[PDB]
Design a protein around this ligand. Sequence first.
Ligand SMILES: Cc1cn([C@H]2C[C@H](O)[C@@H](COP(=O)(O)OP(=O)(O)OP(=O)(O)OP(=O)(O)OP(=O)(O)OC[C@H]3O[C@@H](n4cnc5c(N)ncnc54)[C@H](O)[C@@H]3O)O2)c(=O)[nH]c1=O
Length: 210
Amino acid sequence: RSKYIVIEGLEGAGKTTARNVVVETLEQLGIRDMVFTREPGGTQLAEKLRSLLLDIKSVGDEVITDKAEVLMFYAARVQLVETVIKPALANGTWVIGDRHDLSTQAYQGGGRGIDQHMLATLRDAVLGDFRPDLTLYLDVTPEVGLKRARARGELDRIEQESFDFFNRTRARYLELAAQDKSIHTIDATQPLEAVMDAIRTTVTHWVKEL
Ligand SMILES: Cc1cn([C@H]2C[C@H](O)[C@@H](COP(=O)(O)OP(=O)(O)OP(=O)(O)OP(=O)(O)OP(=O)(O)OC[C@H]3O[C@@H](n4cnc5c(N)ncnc54)[C@H](O)[C@@H]3O)O2)c(=O)[nH]c1=O
């Protein structure tokens, strides 16, 4: 009974540390066959798209249009979904993703301002009814996420955005999470141990209810 779990949040939200907790939890619950995926990326094509999308001046001085941005995130996503994720799930292997469609809804929807209706029809046109079985949205303030991204190194094209861009993106993450009960909003502005605990119980409960 394979499942697709996705972790979401701004850069700097600590999604890898969150995945470590998710893995430990699942393992303690006897769930051990799983593979990881990260978006944008995960296949030769997705990795090339990832570079065009994030590398500073990937296309010189030309500015990538918001819609071209949206469509490349979707090209990378569907490539990954169809050639990696689905087959893994069809094989009984669980899949834990670092970002998925919610990222597009929050960043291109909230941060860029692309119409939600449009994003919805794109998602349906491209992915149909495929959705993650559980999503863990790690909520962190924009200032803390950015501080962490900068401490890490050079900022990608999107992370170089304004505070207002991240502010809008965060809000839309919450807004979308509020309308889907399978998307849990985890308070990640709390100390690490508190965060890790929230994740562990949420996951444990969801699995028990499986
Ligand atoms: C899929 C998609 C993405 N995007 C945007 C989202 C992004 O802005 C950008 C690049 O996306 P990317 O995720 O590949 O970029 P990454 O560099 O991988 O960023 P992540 O989103 O994976 O960051 P995380 O914060 O989860 O990663 P983690 O490795 O856990 O931590 C990042 C750094 O923060 C520190 N950190 C983490 N937690 C910390 C804590 N509690 N205290 C202190 N520091 C902490 C870590 O030490 C590390 O340096 O693309 C869209 O616009 N639309 C889409 O559809």
